Amino acid sequence: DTKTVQNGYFEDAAVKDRTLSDYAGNWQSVYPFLEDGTFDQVFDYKAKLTGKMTQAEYKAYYTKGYQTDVTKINITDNTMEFVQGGQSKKYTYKYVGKKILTYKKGNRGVRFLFEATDADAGQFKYVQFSDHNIAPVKAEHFHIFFGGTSQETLFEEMDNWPTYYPDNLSGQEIAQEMLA
Ligand SMILES: O=C(O)CN(CCN(CC(=O)O)CC(=O)O)CC(=O)O
Ligand code: NA
Ligand code: NA
């Protein structure tokens, strides 16, 4: 991997605070498109390109990465709505900062941290975004992390990173973006 920002190679000083507005939009989980085979062409390509895993190994890795029951997330400049099972839950959020994590392979990434201001947020009280960026820019897709204890609890989760792309894309278009 080239030593670029989006591959996780960046200077600490370039990491800058963001706002929830970077993530505003109507977003969909990519997991159904792994499950229905749309991403098989992605895993075949990755296996042939990098040689680091077989196609089946890549698929298992991304199955663990993408699994979630949160099928849709709708975000405004100050709210997030999670659609999960047969229920929608919407809360107001404030920005609470950022965290630089180091991964086992030696690259790094930044989590951008939000906290619900509503008392009844439960498992959606603490929410983090990772999008391979480190400073303000409109998100094009993201991984999300959420729970009800603290931001710090979520820093331990490294292998499940539910992933979201804009609702206006087909699964095929998401696959194209991943192949690019
Ligand atoms: O982030 C991904 O989608 C898959 N990552 C591994 C998982 N991520 C999780 C994260 O970014 O929060 C870590 C990473 O990309 O180093 C490998 C890759 O991008 O080639
Ligand atoms: Na889930
Ligand atoms: Na997660």
Author numbering: 321 to 500
Q: What are the paper's exact sentences on this?
A:
Zinc is essential for virulence and survival and is acquired solely by the ABC transporter, AdcCB, and two Zn2+-specific cluster A-I SBPs, AdcA and AdcAII, in S. pneumoniae.
The AdcAC domain has a lipocalin-like fold of an 8-stranded up-and-down β-barrel (β9-16) and a helical region of four short helices (α11 to α15). The structure of the AdcAC domain was further analyzed compared to a truncated AdcA variant lacking AdcAN, AdcAC (residues 326 to 501). However, it is highly solvent accessible and is permissive for interaction with Co2+ and Ni2+ ions, similar to ZinT homologs.
